[PDB]
Structure 1
Amino acid sequence: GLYVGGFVDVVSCPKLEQELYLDPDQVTDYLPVTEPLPITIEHLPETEVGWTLGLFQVSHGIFCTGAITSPAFLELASRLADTSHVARAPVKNLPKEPLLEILHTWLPGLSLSSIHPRELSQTPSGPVFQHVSLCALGRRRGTVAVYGHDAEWVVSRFSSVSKSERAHILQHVSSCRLEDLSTPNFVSPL
Protein backbone atom coordinates (compact mmCIF):
# COMPACT_ATOMS: atom_id res chain seq x y z
CA GLY A 1 0.00 0.00 0.00
CA LEU A 2 0.90 3.68 -0.27
CA TYR A 3 -0.24 6.29 2.26
CA VAL A 4 0.47 10.01 2.35
CA GLY A 5 0.31 12.40 5.26
CA GLY A 6 0.98 15.97 6.26
CA PHE A 7 -0.28 19.43 7.08
CA VAL A 8 -2.13 21.11 4.24
CA ASP A 9 -2.50 24.53 2.75
CA VAL A 10 -6.18 25.48 2.32
CA VAL A 11 -6.80 27.15 -1.06
CA SER A 12 -9.87 28.61 -2.79
CA CYS A 13 -9.84 28.53 -6.61
CA PRO A 14 -6.37 26.95 -6.77
CA LYS A 15 -4.32 27.76 -9.91
CA LEU A 16 -6.88 30.39 -11.02
CA GLU A 17 -6.91 34.18 -11.10
CA GLN A 18 -9.12 34.24 -7.99
CA GLU A 19 -6.79 31.94 -6.08
CA LEU A 20 -6.95 32.67 -2.36
CA TYR A 21 -5.08 30.85 0.41
CA LEU A 22 -7.22 30.62 3.55
CA ASP A 23 -6.13 30.86 7.18
CA PRO A 24 -6.96 27.38 8.56
CA ASP A 25 -9.16 28.92 11.26
CA GLN A 26 -11.57 29.97 8.49
CA VAL A 27 -12.50 26.31 7.86
CA THR A 28 -11.93 24.55 11.21
CA ASP A 29 -15.69 24.75 11.93
CA TYR A 30 -16.11 22.37 9.00
CA LEU A 31 -13.60 19.79 10.27
CA PRO A 32 -13.10 16.92 10.65
CA VAL A 33 -13.84 15.53 7.19
CA THR A 34 -14.09 11.76 7.46
CA GLU A 35 -15.52 10.93 4.05
CA PRO A 36 -13.15 10.38 1.11
CA LEU A 37 -12.16 13.24 -1.19
CA PRO A 38 -10.18 12.62 -4.37
CA ILE A 39 -6.43 13.05 -4.31
CA THR A 40 -5.16 14.56 -7.58
CA ILE A 41 -1.91 16.08 -8.85
CA GLU A 42 -1.60 19.90 -9.12
CA HIS A 43 -5.38 20.37 -9.09
CA LEU A 44 -5.73 18.59 -12.44
CA PRO A 45 -8.99 16.60 -12.27
CA GLU A 46 -7.84 13.93 -14.73
CA THR A 47 -4.98 12.89 -12.41
CA GLU A 48 -6.87 11.21 -9.50
CA VAL A 49 -4.44 8.83 -7.77
CA GLY A 50 -6.20 8.07 -4.50
CA TRP A 51 -8.60 9.07 -1.74
CA THR A 52 -8.33 10.99 1.53
CA LEU A 53 -8.87 9.07 4.75
CA GLY A 54 -9.33 12.07 7.04
CA LEU A 55 -8.82 15.80 7.44
CA PHE A 56 -8.39 16.85 11.05
CA GLN A 57 -7.82 20.00 13.07
CA VAL A 58 -4.79 19.56 15.29
CA SER A 59 -2.79 22.07 17.33
CA HIS A 60 -0.40 23.15 14.59
CA GLY A 61 -2.93 23.14 11.76
CA ILE A 62 -4.97 20.87 9.48
CA PHE A 63 -3.59 17.35 8.97
CA CYS A 64 -4.45 15.10 6.04
CA THR A 65 -4.05 11.36 5.69
CA GLY A 66 -4.60 9.75 2.30
CA ALA A 67 -4.26 6.48 0.41
CA ILE A 68 -2.66 6.40 -3.03
CA THR A 69 -4.57 3.54 -4.66
CA SER A 70 -4.34 3.94 -8.43
CA PRO A 71 -2.55 0.92 -9.80
CA ALA A 72 -1.59 2.75 -12.96
CA PHE A 73 0.01 5.56 -10.93
CA LEU A 74 1.70 3.22 -8.48
CA GLU A 75 3.19 1.09 -11.26
CA LEU A 76 4.37 4.09 -13.27
CA ALA A 77 5.85 5.96 -10.28
CA SER A 78 7.65 2.81 -9.04
CA ARG A 79 9.10 2.20 -12.50
CA LEU A 80 10.34 5.79 -12.74
CA ALA A 81 11.80 5.52 -9.28
CA ASP A 82 13.93 2.60 -10.43
CA THR A 83 14.85 3.74 -13.93
CA SER A 84 14.57 7.51 -14.42
CA HIS A 85 17.69 9.60 -13.97
CA VAL A 86 15.53 12.73 -13.96
CA ALA A 87 13.30 11.45 -11.15
CA ARG A 88 16.33 10.40 -9.10
CA ALA A 89 18.49 13.49 -9.71
CA PRO A 90 17.20 15.75 -6.90
CA VAL A 91 16.94 12.92 -4.36
CA LYS A 92 19.76 11.63 -2.10
CA ASN A 93 21.84 8.98 -3.81
CA LEU A 94 21.00 5.30 -3.48
CA PRO A 95 18.01 5.46 -1.20
CA LYS A 96 16.50 2.23 0.15
CA GLU A 97 12.95 3.29 -0.75
CA PRO A 98 13.25 5.27 -3.97
CA LEU A 99 9.53 5.51 -4.67
CA LEU A 100 8.90 7.06 -1.25
CA GLU A 101 11.83 9.47 -1.62
CA ILE A 102 10.88 10.55 -5.12
CA LEU A 103 7.30 11.31 -4.10
CA HIS A 104 8.46 13.17 -0.96
CA THR A 105 10.76 15.26 -3.12
CA TRP A 106 8.75 15.93 -6.32
CA LEU A 107 5.29 16.27 -4.69
CA PRO A 108 6.05 17.83 -1.27
CA GLY A 109 2.85 19.86 -0.94
CA LEU A 110 -0.65 18.89 0.18
CA SER A 111 -3.21 21.38 -1.03
CA LEU A 112 -6.81 21.22 0.17
CA SER A 113 -9.32 22.89 -2.15
CA SER A 114 -12.03 24.90 -0.36
CA ILE A 115 -14.93 27.20 -1.27
CA HIS A 116 -14.25 30.92 -0.87
CA PRO A 117 -14.46 32.59 2.58
CA ARG A 118 -17.46 34.70 1.53
CA GLU A 119 -19.40 31.43 1.62
CA LEU A 120 -18.20 30.77 5.19
CA SER A 121 -19.54 33.94 6.85
CA GLN A 122 -23.04 32.49 6.56
CA THR A 123 -23.80 28.78 6.60
CA PRO A 124 -22.39 27.20 3.44
CA SER A 125 -24.91 25.46 1.18
CA GLY A 126 -22.86 22.52 -0.05
CA PRO A 127 -19.56 20.76 0.63
CA VAL A 128 -16.86 23.11 1.87
CA PHE A 129 -14.02 20.99 0.42
CA GLN A 130 -13.46 19.48 -3.03
CA HIS A 131 -10.22 17.47 -3.17
CA VAL A 132 -6.61 17.34 -1.96
CA SER A 133 -3.81 17.75 -4.47
CA LEU A 134 -0.23 16.58 -4.39
CA CYS A 135 1.71 19.63 -5.53
CA ALA A 136 5.12 20.52 -6.80
CA LEU A 137 4.56 24.24 -6.15
CA GLY A 138 2.57 26.34 -3.70
CA ARG A 139 3.45 25.09 -0.21
CA ARG A 140 3.19 27.82 2.43
CA ARG A 141 1.70 26.75 5.76
CA GLY A 142 1.69 23.07 4.87
CA THR A 143 4.56 20.75 5.78
CA VAL A 144 6.46 18.47 3.43
CA ALA A 145 4.31 15.43 2.64
CA VAL A 146 5.43 12.03 3.94
CA TYR A 147 4.80 8.91 1.89
CA GLY A 148 4.93 5.42 3.38
CA HIS A 149 3.57 1.87 3.30
CA ASP A 150 1.78 2.08 6.63
CA ALA A 151 -0.39 4.87 7.98
CA GLU A 152 0.98 4.63 11.54
CA TRP A 153 4.54 5.04 10.28
CA VAL A 154 3.54 8.05 8.20
CA VAL A 155 1.75 9.95 10.96
CA SER A 156 4.46 9.04 13.48
CA ARG A 157 6.97 11.04 11.39
CA PHE A 158 5.41 14.34 12.53
CA SER A 159 6.67 15.23 15.99
CA SER A 160 4.21 18.16 15.82
CA VAL A 161 1.33 15.66 16.15
CA SER A 162 0.78 14.38 19.67
CA LYS A 163 0.43 10.67 20.42
CA SER A 164 -3.15 11.59 21.31
CA GLU A 165 -3.81 13.35 18.02
CA ARG A 166 -2.07 10.50 16.23
CA ALA A 167 -4.49 8.09 17.88
CA HIS A 168 -7.46 10.19 16.79
CA ILE A 169 -6.12 10.44 13.25
CA LEU A 170 -5.36 6.74 13.00
CA GLN A 171 -8.70 5.79 14.55
CA HIS A 172 -10.51 6.95 11.42
CA VAL A 173 -7.78 5.87 9.00
CA SER A 174 -8.63 2.36 10.15
CA SER A 175 -12.42 2.77 10.28
CA CYS A 176 -12.94 3.98 6.71
CA ARG A 177 -11.81 1.14 4.44
CA LEU A 178 -10.22 1.49 1.02
CA GLU A 179 -10.81 -1.70 -0.89
CA ASP A 180 -14.43 -0.75 -1.64
CA LEU A 181 -13.57 2.69 -3.07
CA SER A 182 -13.77 3.20 -6.81
CA THR A 183 -10.63 3.17 -8.93
CA PRO A 184 -9.15 6.67 -9.33
CA ASN A 185 -9.14 8.04 -12.91
CA PHE A 186 -5.35 8.44 -13.52
CA VAL A 187 -4.17 6.99 -16.84
CA SER A 188 -0.50 6.27 -17.43
CA PRO A 189 0.80 8.22 -20.46
CA LEU A 190 3.27 5.35 -21.08
Structure 2
Amino acid sequence: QGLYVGGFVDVVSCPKLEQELYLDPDQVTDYLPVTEPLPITIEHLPETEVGWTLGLFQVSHGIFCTGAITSPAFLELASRLADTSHVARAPVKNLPKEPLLEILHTWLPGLSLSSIHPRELSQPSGPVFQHVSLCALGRRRGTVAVYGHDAEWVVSRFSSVSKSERAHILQHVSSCRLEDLSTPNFVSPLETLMAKAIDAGFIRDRLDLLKTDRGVASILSPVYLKA
Protein backbone atom coordinates (compact mmCIF):
# COMPACT_ATOMS: atom_id res chain seq x y z
CA GLN A 1 0.00 0.00 0.00
CA GLY A 2 2.65 2.50 1.06
CA LEU A 3 5.66 2.90 -1.22
CA TYR A 4 8.90 3.33 0.65
CA VAL A 5 12.44 4.08 -0.39
CA GLY A 6 15.58 3.37 1.62
CA GLY A 7 19.28 3.63 1.05
CA PHE A 8 22.51 5.36 1.85
CA VAL A 9 23.12 8.99 0.80
CA ASP A 10 26.76 8.60 1.95
CA VAL A 11 28.92 5.52 2.72
CA VAL A 12 31.72 6.19 5.18
CA SER A 13 34.13 3.61 3.89
CA CYS A 14 34.34 4.94 0.28
CA PRO A 15 37.39 6.80 -0.93
CA LYS A 16 36.79 10.49 -0.81
CA LEU A 17 37.95 12.78 -3.60
CA GLU A 18 35.84 15.79 -4.35
CA GLN A 19 36.24 18.14 -1.38
CA GLU A 20 32.73 19.63 -1.96
CA LEU A 21 31.16 16.14 -1.55
CA TYR A 22 32.89 15.22 1.68
CA LEU A 23 30.60 14.61 4.65
CA ASP A 24 32.77 14.41 7.78
CA PRO A 25 31.22 11.76 10.09
CA ASP A 26 32.65 13.61 13.11
CA GLN A 27 30.87 16.79 11.88
CA VAL A 28 27.41 15.61 10.73
CA THR A 29 26.68 14.00 14.13
CA ASP A 30 25.38 17.33 15.46
CA TYR A 31 22.87 17.63 12.61
CA LEU A 32 21.65 13.98 12.68
CA PRO A 33 19.24 12.38 12.93
CA VAL A 34 16.86 14.48 10.84
CA THR A 35 13.30 13.54 11.71
CA GLU A 36 11.59 16.62 10.22
CA PRO A 37 10.34 15.58 6.74
CA LEU A 38 12.56 16.73 3.86
CA PRO A 39 11.28 16.81 0.31
CA ILE A 40 12.11 13.94 -2.03
CA THR A 41 12.39 15.29 -5.59
CA ILE A 42 13.48 14.04 -9.00
CA GLU A 43 17.01 14.93 -10.10
CA HIS A 44 17.08 18.13 -8.00
CA LEU A 45 14.13 19.72 -9.80
CA PRO A 46 12.37 21.52 -6.96
CA GLU A 47 8.86 21.32 -8.48
CA THR A 48 9.06 17.52 -8.69
CA GLU A 49 8.32 16.71 -5.06
CA VAL A 50 7.21 13.04 -4.98
CA GLY A 51 7.18 12.40 -1.26
CA TRP A 52 8.96 13.00 2.00
CA THR A 53 11.88 11.69 3.98
CA LEU A 54 10.92 9.76 7.13
CA GLY A 55 14.36 10.03 8.66
CA LEU A 56 18.01 10.54 7.89
CA PHE A 57 20.12 8.52 10.29
CA GLN A 58 23.80 8.22 11.12
CA VAL A 59 24.68 4.51 11.25
CA SER A 60 28.04 2.75 11.33
CA HIS A 61 28.20 2.35 7.56
CA GLY A 62 27.16 6.00 6.72
CA ILE A 63 24.08 8.20 6.46
CA PHE A 64 20.92 6.16 5.78
CA CYS A 65 17.69 7.64 4.44
CA THR A 66 14.15 6.32 4.58
CA GLY A 67 11.28 8.01 2.77
CA ALA A 68 7.76 7.64 1.47
CA ILE A 69 6.79 8.20 -2.16
CA THR A 70 3.30 9.68 -1.94
CA SER A 71 2.48 11.93 -4.88
CA PRO A 72 -0.54 10.69 -6.90
CA ALA A 73 0.56 12.57 -10.03
CA PHE A 74 4.05 11.12 -9.85
CA LEU A 75 2.78 7.57 -9.27
CA GLU A 76 0.44 8.01 -12.27
CA LEU A 77 3.40 8.99 -14.44
CA ALA A 78 5.52 6.14 -13.13
CA SER A 79 2.71 3.72 -13.88
CA ARG A 80 2.36 5.06 -17.46
CA LEU A 81 6.09 4.59 -18.03
CA ALA A 82 5.95 1.06 -16.55
CA ASP A 83 3.17 0.24 -19.09
CA THR A 84 5.56 0.48 -22.02
CA SER A 85 9.05 0.06 -20.50
CA HIS A 86 10.51 -3.30 -21.43
CA VAL A 87 13.07 -3.23 -18.60
CA ALA A 88 10.34 -2.38 -16.04
CA ARG A 89 8.17 -5.23 -17.33
CA ALA A 90 10.85 -7.94 -17.36
CA PRO A 91 10.66 -10.62 -14.65
CA VAL A 92 12.83 -10.21 -11.58
CA LYS A 93 14.63 -13.33 -10.32
CA ASN A 94 12.82 -14.83 -7.33
CA LEU A 95 10.32 -12.00 -6.85
CA PRO A 96 6.75 -11.44 -8.01
CA LYS A 97 5.99 -8.64 -10.45
CA GLU A 98 5.77 -5.21 -8.87
CA PRO A 99 5.37 -2.69 -11.73
CA LEU A 100 5.85 0.52 -9.66
CA LEU A 101 8.91 -0.83 -7.85
CA GLU A 102 10.43 -2.04 -11.10
CA ILE A 103 9.94 1.23 -13.01
CA LEU A 104 11.50 3.17 -10.09
CA HIS A 105 14.50 0.88 -10.13
CA THR A 106 14.82 1.31 -13.87
CA TRP A 107 14.33 5.11 -14.13
CA LEU A 108 15.63 6.37 -10.79
CA PRO A 109 18.00 3.82 -9.22
CA GLY A 110 20.17 6.38 -7.38
CA LEU A 111 19.82 8.57 -4.28
CA SER A 112 21.41 11.99 -3.99
CA LEU A 113 21.57 14.28 -0.95
CA SER A 114 21.55 18.05 -1.29
CA SER A 115 23.31 19.62 1.65
CA ILE A 116 25.14 22.79 2.63
CA HIS A 117 28.59 23.32 1.14
CA PRO A 118 31.18 21.87 3.57
CA ARG A 119 33.05 25.21 3.83
CA GLU A 120 29.80 26.81 5.01
CA LEU A 121 29.50 24.56 8.07
CA SER A 122 30.16 27.48 10.45
CA GLN A 123 28.76 28.10 13.95
CA PRO A 124 24.95 28.18 8.68
CA SER A 125 23.27 30.63 6.25
CA GLY A 126 20.64 27.98 5.24
CA PRO A 127 19.50 24.51 6.72
CA VAL A 128 22.21 21.75 6.64
CA PHE A 129 20.25 19.04 4.81
CA GLN A 130 18.00 20.44 2.09
CA HIS A 131 16.43 17.49 0.24
CA VAL A 132 17.00 14.04 -1.16
CA SER A 133 16.59 13.37 -4.88
CA LEU A 134 15.93 10.25 -6.83
CA CYS A 135 18.28 10.13 -9.78
CA ALA A 136 19.82 8.13 -12.63
CA LEU A 137 23.13 7.67 -10.78
CA GLY A 138 24.52 9.19 -7.59
CA ARG A 139 27.71 11.26 -7.42
CA ARG A 140 28.54 9.51 -4.14
CA ARG A 141 29.33 5.74 -4.34
CA GLY A 142 27.00 3.21 -2.70
CA THR A 143 23.88 5.40 -2.99
CA VAL A 144 21.52 3.02 -4.77
CA ALA A 145 17.94 3.06 -3.68
CA VAL A 146 15.81 0.12 -2.57
CA TYR A 147 12.11 0.64 -3.28
CA GLY A 148 9.50 -1.49 -1.50
CA HIS A 149 6.01 -1.71 -0.06
CA ASP A 150 7.20 -3.08 3.33
CA ALA A 151 9.60 -0.69 5.20
CA GLU A 152 11.02 -3.56 7.31
CA TRP A 153 11.81 -5.44 4.11
CA VAL A 154 13.44 -2.38 2.50
CA VAL A 155 15.76 -1.78 5.53
CA SER A 156 16.49 -5.48 5.93
CA ARG A 157 17.98 -5.51 2.39
CA PHE A 158 20.97 -3.56 3.78
CA SER A 159 23.20 -6.10 5.50
CA SER A 160 25.40 -3.09 6.42
CA VAL A 161 22.62 -1.93 8.77
CA SER A 162 22.69 -3.90 12.04
CA LYS A 163 19.69 -5.55 13.65
CA SER A 164 19.89 -2.89 16.37
CA GLU A 165 20.17 0.02 13.92
CA ARG A 166 17.28 -1.36 11.86
CA ALA A 167 15.01 -1.60 14.91
CA HIS A 168 15.75 2.02 15.73
CA ILE A 169 15.13 3.21 12.20
CA LEU A 170 11.87 1.28 11.92
CA GLN A 171 10.65 2.46 15.34
CA HIS A 172 10.82 5.95 13.88
CA VAL A 173 9.39 4.96 10.47
CA SER A 174 6.41 3.22 12.20
CA SER A 175 5.60 6.38 14.15
CA CYS A 176 5.03 8.27 10.88
CA ARG A 177 1.42 7.97 9.69
CA LEU A 178 1.76 8.47 5.94
CA GLU A 179 -1.76 9.82 5.73
CA ASP A 180 -0.65 12.80 7.85
CA LEU A 181 2.06 14.00 5.43
CA SER A 182 1.14 16.94 3.18
CA THR A 183 0.56 16.49 -0.54
CA PRO A 184 3.85 16.95 -2.41
CA ASN A 185 4.03 19.69 -5.06
CA PHE A 186 4.58 17.61 -8.17
CA VAL A 187 4.19 19.30 -11.50
CA SER A 188 5.62 17.09 -14.20
CA PRO A 189 8.14 18.91 -16.42
CA LEU A 190 7.99 16.07 -18.86
CA GLU A 191 10.43 17.40 -21.49
CA THR A 192 12.99 18.21 -18.79
CA LEU A 193 12.67 14.67 -17.35
CA MET A 194 13.05 13.13 -20.86
CA ALA A 195 16.23 15.23 -21.45
CA LYS A 196 17.67 13.92 -18.20
CA ALA A 197 16.78 10.30 -19.13
CA ILE A 198 18.50 10.78 -22.53
CA ASP A 199 21.61 12.21 -20.86
CA ALA A 200 21.67 9.33 -18.32
CA GLY A 201 22.11 6.83 -21.18
CA PHE A 202 25.38 8.51 -22.13
CA ILE A 203 26.96 8.36 -18.67
CA ARG A 204 30.10 6.35 -19.21
CA ASP A 205 30.22 3.12 -17.18
CA ARG A 206 26.82 3.77 -15.61
CA LEU A 207 25.70 0.16 -15.34
CA ASP A 208 29.12 -0.87 -13.91
CA LEU A 209 28.84 1.91 -11.30
CA LEU A 210 25.29 0.83 -10.39
CA LYS A 211 26.51 -2.77 -9.94
CA THR A 212 29.41 -1.60 -7.82
CA ASP A 213 27.09 0.60 -5.74
CA ARG A 214 24.93 -2.39 -4.77
CA GLY A 215 28.05 -4.05 -3.31
CA VAL A 216 29.25 -0.84 -1.60
CA ALA A 217 25.78 -0.55 0.00
CA SER A 218 25.84 -4.28 0.92
CA ILE A 219 22.41 -5.00 -0.48
CA LEU A 220 21.07 -8.55 -0.09
CA SER A 221 19.14 -10.42 -2.75
CA PRO A 222 16.40 -10.81 -3.68
CA VAL A 223 15.66 -7.17 -4.57
CA TYR A 224 14.07 -5.29 -7.45
CA LEU A 225 17.35 -3.63 -8.55
CA LYS A 226 17.81 -3.67 -12.31
CA ALA A 227 21.64 -3.47 -12.19
* TM-score in terms of structure 1 length: 0.82
Aligned to 2:112: 111
Equivalents in 2 of 1:148, 1:27: separation in Å? 28
Query: For residues 84-122 of structure 1, what are the alpha-carbon distances to aligned partners after superposition, in whole Å with 9 as ceiling and x for unaligned?
Result: 347558988996113212212321211111111122243
Equivalents in 2 of 1:120, 1:179: separation in Å? 35
Equivalents in 2 of 1:160, 1:14: separation in Å? 17
The structural deviation recorded for 1:170 is 0.6
Over 3 Å counting, the alpha-carbon distance change for 1:31 and 1:97 in structure 2 is: same
- Higher strand proportion, which one? 1
Over 3 Å counting, the alpha-carbon distance change for 1:73 and 1:10 in structure 2 is: farther
Q: Give the conservation status (yes or no) of the 8 Å contact 1:112–1:129.
A: yes
Equivalents in 1 of 2:21, 2:84: separation in Å? 38
- For structure 2, which runs of at least 5 residues remain unmatched after alignment? 188-220, 223-227
State the identity %.
100
- Higher helix proportion, which one? 2
Over 3 Å counting, the alpha-carbon distance change for 1:6 and 1:13 in structure 2 is: closer
Equivalents in 1 of 2:126, 2:179: separation in Å? 27
Cα RMSD of the aligned pairs, angstroms, is: 5.2
Query: For residues 122-145 of structure 1, what are the alpha-carbon distances to aligned partners after superposition, in whole Å with 9 as ceiling and x for unaligned?
Result: 3x3542111100011334333320
Query: For residues 13-56 of structure 1, what are the alpha-carbon distances to aligned partners after superposition, in whole Å with 9 as ceiling and x for unaligned?
Result: 99999964545554232100001000000000011000000000
Query: For residues 148-170 of structure 1, what are the alpha-carbon distances to aligned partners after superposition, in whole Å with 9 as ceiling and x for unaligned?
Result: 11211111111111111001101
Q: Give the conservation status (yes or no) of the 8 Å contact 1:49–1:70.
A: yes
Q: Give the conservation status (yes or no) of the 8 Å contact 1:49–1:185.
A: yes
- Asked if 1:129 is matched to 2:134, the reply is no
Q: Give the conservation status (yes or no) of the 8 Å contact 1:10–1:112.
A: no
Q: Give the conservation status (yes or no) of the 8 Å contact 1:12–1:116.
A: no
Equivalents in 2 of 1:155, 1:88: separation in Å? 24
Equivalents in 2 of 1:42, 1:155: separation in Å? 23
Report which stretch shifted further, 26-35 or 11-20. Answer: 11-20
Report which stretch shifted further, 141-150 or 64-73. Answer: 141-150
- Asked if 1:90 is matched to 2:115, the reply is no
Report which stretch shifted further, 74-83 or 9-18. Answer: 9-18
* TM-score in terms of structure 2 length: 0.70
